[PDB]
Amino acid sequence: NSFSGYLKLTDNVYIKNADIVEEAKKVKPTVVVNAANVYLKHGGGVAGALNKATNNAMQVESDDYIATNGPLKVGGSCVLSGHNLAKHCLHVVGPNVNKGEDIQLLKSAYENFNQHEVLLAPLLSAGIFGADPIHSLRVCVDTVRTNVYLAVFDKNLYDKLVSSFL
């Protein structure tokens, strides 16, 4: 299909060193995953980058969602518009280890991916959420059964994830 340049890790998990924003703009996937928080406040990390690329439309939509439905749970998700990036955005809340949230909820977070056949996604709970990216990749592989294309921004981290994969 339109996903190009990925390394195959398993039957269903693929990985690339790429900026998820630039990869979404090129591919226009059906589903892009956002690394959200429970308030859908898209300030930094992946969320801030995705929101910026939508010219803040993602944040306006998200504020309406929260006003109607209240916060998400850690491990939970919602499906909103993908704006100019994708058909849909799956906002998924992984645990934030810097807030003391339970790392076991990472598995629950990845289970949300199984409701969608194909996804472009970041590693959940990595980056500013404080979890070990090697662990996040392992949980992903062991949990997700649908086709997931992972975009890893940092080249040094990408190389470490590939070279330590087991």
What DSSP string describes the chain?
----SPEE-SSSEEEEES-HHHHHHHH--SEEEEE--TT----SHHHHHHHHHTTTHHHHHHHHHHHHH-PPPTT-EEEEE-TTT-SEEEEE----GGGT--TTHHHHHHHGGGGSSEEEEPPTT-GGG---HHHHHHHHHHH--SEEEEEE--HHHHHHHHHT--
Domain count, the chain: 1
76 burial via Cβ count (<10 Å: 0-12, 13-18, 19+): middle
CA–CA dist 19, 16 (Å, integer): 9
Q: Does some domain include residue 2?
A: no
The domain that holds 101 is classified in CATH as 3.40.220.10
Q: Does some domain include residue 108?
A: yes
Domain that holds residue 91: 7-162
Q: Does some domain include residue 126?
A: yes
Q: Does some domain include residue 1?
A: no
Method for structure elucidation = X-ray
